[PDB]
């Protein structure tokens, strides 16, 4: 069902929702971005007197234009006159009421408790999955599986935060305490469990290694449970690993990471540098998997302090039958 | 020793002159804009105008990487303030006031933004 | 699990081989003699002469 | 035409040799050169009356895993020094003058093996490069730089075996093990101006790389030709030849029988077969042939010593074009094989460390 | 059937 | 089960 | 030609021995520490201006550096060290300046440690007080010319306090021209300021020059004239000194006096060899020394004692020489390894070696620098001298 | 099946048809080459060369390394000494990869190639291998259809007469080759008429 | 004394044992007067290869071993120099200034010197 | 019995050792007397107390003649 | 235990200006 340009000629005038029926389909509220990578949707829409008229054209598509600015609007007198700058608001007013007169504890993956007839219950995704709800729930706003936000004054980094104490990260909308959500571009911060999001990642360096193939050493330095960088990669389903790795494993050599029960992150074909981290049992860095705006991504910390030039590992919690890489 | 170094994307040598903390890894990659973009004209249940807006609003957000709502409300702003230009070579005003409008439906942005964008626009 | 590359690497050492050899032709440090040829020492001077590289500089033309 | 063994010389390394090729940057009368490629070996030759053979330099590297598999000839534009390039599985690319014999300039940017070289046609200092890390690339020698990689995201999902540079040198082809074959391109905005940018650049003038001007989209991808590995493939015009371990070499354009070349797009998915030169016995990979500088002839080999040569013009070509060429001494394989620049000669070296140079009545 | 079941290789015995 | 790292 | 292939072929030779050398070094030390700089350096110099804190087992010092680099902004260096003194440790930069040109070679008045001298490959030479002075540059901030001096035609190497009285200071160059000023006459803007006298004995470029540490009108010359000349102020003569010879065989670079002694001179040149001699009688060599393999630059006399010495040059090779052991005969093997006034060798640098210096506040603590960025500072071996 | 005996009798009369088209384009063809190529001989006859002799070198090259070769050709056999090469530093081994900041999403599937390789230097791979990759893409594998390809104009006359003699075939043809599996591409193409 | 020595290569192979004309390194030819002096001198001078002993039943025993690591790279400018290419600059190039990154290494601190060279005779 | 790889491996550390034993003993990188566990070369102490160094015997009677 | 450590210098002259029959009776 398409409904060509309101800029060019054919401008077939349709209903309000069929002028919004891509744009309704296609963005993605939890990318804030259109046909997003890591966003596979495929839902369709269940629901969010006397004196005489003027004698000129609604030119077509000005129809379906005028008429979803109805729904938005909520009888605007003026302002559909300030945007639609060749229409008399007469006219407008005229053409309203004519048309209208016409008319195993494992790990899962997020998505909210999507309910109409009740609010986070038996029915919540999250609640039977031990899950949090996200700033996406058709529950009520007062739904109790949702996440409250810490309230920390500066550092959310301890125990004493609940954001770290759970395994997540400070969403800047519901914790305005720490400066999360202070700073529209900007990262001068105190928060230290919001960089993950806002990507301060480390100027970190590739070079040969001294274990095994490459390896990746971090230039400046930094200290214990500080944040290093997001070991990304495509994120795929747990066969398609398991076919993947028969050859990697022919090879000798993986990047797989196992992010949760439901999905796998592989950055064999594309991620970024960190993926060349070696391994050994005594690291200078190790990692976590964390929830972030509803995303498992995953991040990696310093085991302990580090100056210039060293190396960096992790633990990869094998059994080391594997050889050393 | 603090040793030889390398760059990563194409396993060259890395001079010290160039070691200059620009770290040849920044938010938007070279590829994945052009990926989106041919993605794009992959669809059929679309329209050209609608489609041109999608991708410049794509790159947009890809560019600055803005995820929180609020940045929003300042984003499509910035969105007018960088490519207005190119909207003007193009004249997409319907379809980016369309654009607008569905954004004012995730309760992301309000009226008042919308009108105010679009007054920023001319 | 690593090697890393020895720097000598066989373009070099057949330049030891051929002084080596036409040195135990002349002056035969290791046959007619001791592994040791004599002291070596009180010459001084003209010592240079024999290998071609008893010292070279690593730098011929120079700012100072 | 009709050819004849005169000469089956032979080394003693004895392990296989795998490339071959001619120095089409004779002089008109300069006699004739041609070199050859093994396990550690560099080995020239040249061309003397009665299939006499004048061998002229051979070289070596000290490493033992290495084993250069490739070669190809270029020139010095500034100095007319010829220089010959060469490269395999220890992964690098290095230089040859045979003038000063020293190696002169080496790359560094593979990751794997080196299964190919070229030259772009017109400009001798663009060495392609394809290698089995998925990847290939695009050196400036002259300038001592990388300029383009042709890879990554789309498309080369495994390993890669050959490549060209059409007639022209404003277009290119490679030929991949993931039973596929890709288009590139060498005359668009963005990579002539990336190049452009290459012949002007000095590192000792910026504090700030030269930016490798990457490029991930095929202008064209297909699938559909082969079932099978892809031992290497040339340009026939504005056509493309493209052989397999299928014992059969085919012809091929992109979409139908009348479109043009450059009005294609990488949507274009549609292909056209129509011609199909057959032959038997290959069932190894890696296994190439070529063409002459006239594209009037084509040679190939094959896992027991039969040769192949398919006399292009005039066939139909599927029906015809079959014209073998044997002793049964070098019951070995051969890979490759190699015209001089008019098409007097042949040569085809084999696994047992051979060679075997054919000659042709007049 | 034969070639799914023969794969490739660059030598012979 | 192929190699999948844990943390 | 040939000469390209055995250069690099010496080259390898050089990482052998360089790894020989580290190899060895816990049998030959007690201290080293090697650092890289970003870019090379044409001089080192301690300080006097030490500092220690309480409750710990390490010391912190001072050295000048210089830079030698390809087109980019010299600027100097006032670094800090750190280091374990008597009983873990490192050293880092503290302070940089720009500086217009290179640098030639650098000192400082020692009367104020705060005040230092610099060269150029330009004619003038220079002053800072790093006190009125940034910690690090910023490319927006003006440079600190902090003074400025005039009366070359040249640039040199040559500089030179003299610490019994402060301001005087003395230069050289290719003008064959040694220069003299003193600074206390104007504190006032007084930018530029030219000299108080010259003098022109010599005949070929005049390398070095330096002070008489307890005298006062008096100095000494070097020149590649295979000449060396004594001049003397107050004695109103510029083209002739109170004393000449001719000292080397080749050319002569460097020069230095001794702290105890009054009349001991000692001289380094190009003829592969030092010498030295007494202030009474010039004409009398009292002796050499034959151990080095090529030219020398530097000499410096240590403090903590007058019996020793050192040198260094273009042999990648830095000798310390002790005046105790002459005319000492030894076992056949010791004369196998090299004379007995030869004390101790340092072979750890892989280049050749532009600069170096003793420390005071620390007994035989030596910092070299090359040019191949390596700064290294070390205690020689203890149990050498019981 | 008779689909393949009708595929190659449709086979037979487009080739005809479009032979006779082609060959007048392969005349073409080799005209462009002609042209092409003559330039090429053009800005070859415009340049000099330096071409190659042998070794004259009479220092330093006493007891080394030397190649030569034999023949079955009367000729002699011919030592000569073999230079060796200024060895260069490598570096380790990289299957190439593309840059990104943020997690990726790509669904893959079944027999999509880039078919194994593993070698063939040690066992030629190992027998299970077979059952691997079998397993993997459950006995699929690229190009493992009977016929050669599938091609637009081949692909509607087939259905067409295959109707002649819409989903019957449609849907049995898709199971045939692994093209569309099912009728969906059939449909679409059907659907493009 | 007496001295013997004992090549070996795979663990398994042809020895071609040894002897010695004098109590001296076989090598670079120093006159070592000790046992401990001449192993010390043979496992740091000549380091390229390995050596064991139990010096002997009769005082001569020694096992050589070509060292599989020895770490036998360039140590300079790590850039520049390794990858300098086969033209003017490749190895050396030293010629005008050139940066490295700030390293620093510190190889002795203050040593533990034990009167006994034994030691080494005993693990 | 492979010799051949036997002798192409001791054959560089031979090679390399023999070349650095002529230099040494002529240009050496250090000393093997100050060098500690060669602790028993050029027996010594730290004895002179010098400064008043002329001896100054240098009669030097060398004349010419022809 | 046989053969001097001249064995080292039939491994740097294996070939030429070589003789004594101890270099050659050496392996």
């Not at chain 2, 603090?2 to 001079?15: A, G, K, V, W």
Request: net charge negative; glycine share 4%; aromatic share 10%.
């Amino acid at each position: 069902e398409c409904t060509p340009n309101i800029d060019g000629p054919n401008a077939k005038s349709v209903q309000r929702e069929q002028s919004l029926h891509s744009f309704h389909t296609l963005f993605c509220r939890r990318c804030f971005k259109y046909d997003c990578f890591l966003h596979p949707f495929h839902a369709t829409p269940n629901t969010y007197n006397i004196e005489p008229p003027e004698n000129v054209e609604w030119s077509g598509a000005e129809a379906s234009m005028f008429r979803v600015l109805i729904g938005t609007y909520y009888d605007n007198f003026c302002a559909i006159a300030r945007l639609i700058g060749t229409k008399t608001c007469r006219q407008v007013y005229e053409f309203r009421v004519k048309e209208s007169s016409i008319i195993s504890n494992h790990v899962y993956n997020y998505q909210p408790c999507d309910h109409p007839r009740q609010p986070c219950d038996s029915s919540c995704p999250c609640v039977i999955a031990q899950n949090f709800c996200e700033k996406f729930c058709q529950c009520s706003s007062e739904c109790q599986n949702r996440f409250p936000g810490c309230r920390c004054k500066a550092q959310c980094n301890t125990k004493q935060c609940p954001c770290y104490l759970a395994v997540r990260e400070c969403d800047p909308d519901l914790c305005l305490t720490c400066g999360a959500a202070d700073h529209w571009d900007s990262k001068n911060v105190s928060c230290k469990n919001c960089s993950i999001q806002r990507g301060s990642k480390k100027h970190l360096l590739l070079a040969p290694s001294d274990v095994a193939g490459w390896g990746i050493f971090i230039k400046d330095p930094v200290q214990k449970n500080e944040f290093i960088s997001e070991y990304c990669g495509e994120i795929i389903s747990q066969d398609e690993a398991d076919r993947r790795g028969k050859v990697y494993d022919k090879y000798m050599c993986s990047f797989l990471f196992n992010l949760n029960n439901d999905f796998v992150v592989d950055a064999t074909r594309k991620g970024n540098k960190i993926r060349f981290a070696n391994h050994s049992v005594n690291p200078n860095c190790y990692a976590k998997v964390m929830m972030v705006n509803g995303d498992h991504r995953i991040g990696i910390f310093a085991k302990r302090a580090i100056q210039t030039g060293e190396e960096l590992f992790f633990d990869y919690r094998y059994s080391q039958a594997d050889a050393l890489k | 020793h603090n040793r030889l170094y390398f760059h990563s994307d194409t396993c060259l040598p890395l001079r010290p002159q160039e070691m200059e903390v620009d770290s040849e890894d920044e938010k938007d990659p070279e590829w994945l804009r052009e990926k989106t973009i041919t993605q794009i004209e992959e669809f059929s249940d679309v329209n050209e105008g609608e489609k041109e807006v999608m991708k410049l609003w794509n790159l947009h957000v890809m560019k600055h990487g803005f995820i929180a709502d609020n940045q929003m409300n300042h984003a499509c702003m910035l969105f007018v303030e960088n490519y207005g230009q190119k909207i003007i070579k193009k004249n997409l005003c319907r379809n980016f006031m369309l654009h607008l409008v569905s954004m004012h439906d995730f309760n992301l942005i309000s009226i008042m933004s919308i009108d105010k964008a679009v007054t920023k626009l001319r | 699990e690593d090697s890393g590359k020895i720097k000598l690497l066989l373009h070099w050492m057949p330049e030891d081989i051929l002084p080596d050899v036409w040195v135990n032709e002349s002056e035969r440090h290791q046959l007619k003699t001791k592994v040791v040829h004599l002291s070596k020492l009180p010459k001084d001077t003209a010592l240079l002469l024999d290998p071609n590289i008893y010292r070279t500089m690593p730098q011929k033309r120079l700012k100072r | 035409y009709s050819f004849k063994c005169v000469n089956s010389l032979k080394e003693d390394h004895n392990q296989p040799l795998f490339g071959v090729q001619f120095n089409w940057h004779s002089k008109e009368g300069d006699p004739l050169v041609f070199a050859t490629v093994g396990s550690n070996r560099v080995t020239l030759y040249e061309c003397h009356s009665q299939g006499e053979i004048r061998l002229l330099q051979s070289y070596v590297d000290a490493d033992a895993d290495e084993n250069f598999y490739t070669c190809a000839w270029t020139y010095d534009s500034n100095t007319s020094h010829p220089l010959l390039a060469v490269a395999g599985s220890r992964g690098i690319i290095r230089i040859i003058n045979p003038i000063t014999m020293q190696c002169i300039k080496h790359y560094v940017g593979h990751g794997n093996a080196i299964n190919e070289l070229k030259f772009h046609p017109r400009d001798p200092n663009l060495l392609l490069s394809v290698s089995k890390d998925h990847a290939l690339r695009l050196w400036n020698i002259q300038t001592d730089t990388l300029v383009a990689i042709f890879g990554g995201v789309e498309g080369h999902r495994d390993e890669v075996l050959s490549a060209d540079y059409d007639l022209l040198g404003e277009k290119i082809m490679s030929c991949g093990m993931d039973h596929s074959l890709k288009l590139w391109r060498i005359n668009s905005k963005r990579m002539m101006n990336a190049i452009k940018e290459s012949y002007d650049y000095n590192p000792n003038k910026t504090n700030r790389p030269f930016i490798s001007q990457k490029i991930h989209f095929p202008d064209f991808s297909t699938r559909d030709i082969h079932r099978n590995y892809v031992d290497c493939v040339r340009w026939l015009g504005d056509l493309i030849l493209s052989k397999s371990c299928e014992n059969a070499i085919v012809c091929w354009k992109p979409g139908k029988m009348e479109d043009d070349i450059d009005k294609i797009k990488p949507s274009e998915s549609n292909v056209t077969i129509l011609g199909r030169f057959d032959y038997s016995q290959c069932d190894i990979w890696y296994m190439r042939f070529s063409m002459d500088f006239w594209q009037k002839m084509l040679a190939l080999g094959n896992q027991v010593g039969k040769l192949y040569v398919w006399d292009l013009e005039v066939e139909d070509p599927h029906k015809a074009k079959c014209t073998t060429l044997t002793h049964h001494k070098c019951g070995a394989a051969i890979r490759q094989t190699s015209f001089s620049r008019d098409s007097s000669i042949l040569i085809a070296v084999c696994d047992d460390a051979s060679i075997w140079r054919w000659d042709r009545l007049r | 059937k034969r070639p799914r079941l023969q794969a490739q290789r660059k030598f012979a015995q | 089960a192929a190699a999948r790292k844990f943390a | 030609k040939e000469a390209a292939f055995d250069d690099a072929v010496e080259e390898r030779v050089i990482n052998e021995e360089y790894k020989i050398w580290k190899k060895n070094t816990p049998f030959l030390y007690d201290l080293v520490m090697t650092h890289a700089l970003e870019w090379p350096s044409l001089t080192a110099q301690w300080l006097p201006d030490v500092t220690r804190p309480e409750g710990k087992d390490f010391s912190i010092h001072r050295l000048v550096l210089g830079t030698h680099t390809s087109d980019e902004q010299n600027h100097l260096v006032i670094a800090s060290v750190q280091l374990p003194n008597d009983d873990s440790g490192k050293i880092e930069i503290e302070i940089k300046i720009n500086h217009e040109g290179e640098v030639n070679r650098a000192r400082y008045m020692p009367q104020n440690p705060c005040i230092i001298a610099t060269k150029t490959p330009s004619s003038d030479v220079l002053v800072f007080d790093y006190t009125k002075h940034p910690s690090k540059p910023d490319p927006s901030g003006e440079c600190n010319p902090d003074l400025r001096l005039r009366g070359h035609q040249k640039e040199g190497y040559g500089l030179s306090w003299n610490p019994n009285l402060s301001g005087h200071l003395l230069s050289a160059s290719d003008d064959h021209t040694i220069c003299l000023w003193d600074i206390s006459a104007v504190p006032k803007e007084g930018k530029v300021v030219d000299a108080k006298t010259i003098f022109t004995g010599h005949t070929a470029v005049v390398e070095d020059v330096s002070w008489h540490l307890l005298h006062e009108s008096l100095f000494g010359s070097v020149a590649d004239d295979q000449k060396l000349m004594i001049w003397d102020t107050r004695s109103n003569n510029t083209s002739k000194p109170s004393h000449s010879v001719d000292a080397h065989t080749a050319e002569v670079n460097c020069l230095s006096f001794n702290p105890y002694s009054e009349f001991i001179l000692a001289t380094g040149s190009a003829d592969k060899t030092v010498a030295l001699w007494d202030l009474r009688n010039l004409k009398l060599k009292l002796h050499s020394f034959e151990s080095h393999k090529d030219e020398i630059f530097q000499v410096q006399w240590s403090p903590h004692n007058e019996t020793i010495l050192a040198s260094s040059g273009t042999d990648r090779r830095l000798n310390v020489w002790d005046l105790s052991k002459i005319g000492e005969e030894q076992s056949p093997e010791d004369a196998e390894d090299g004379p007995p006034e030869l004390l101790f060798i340092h072979g750890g640098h892989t280049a050749k070696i532009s600069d170096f210096s003793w420390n005071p506040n620390e007994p035989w603590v030596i910092c070299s620098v090359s040019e191949d960025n390596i700064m290294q500072v070390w205690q020689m071996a203890e149990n050498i001298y019981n």
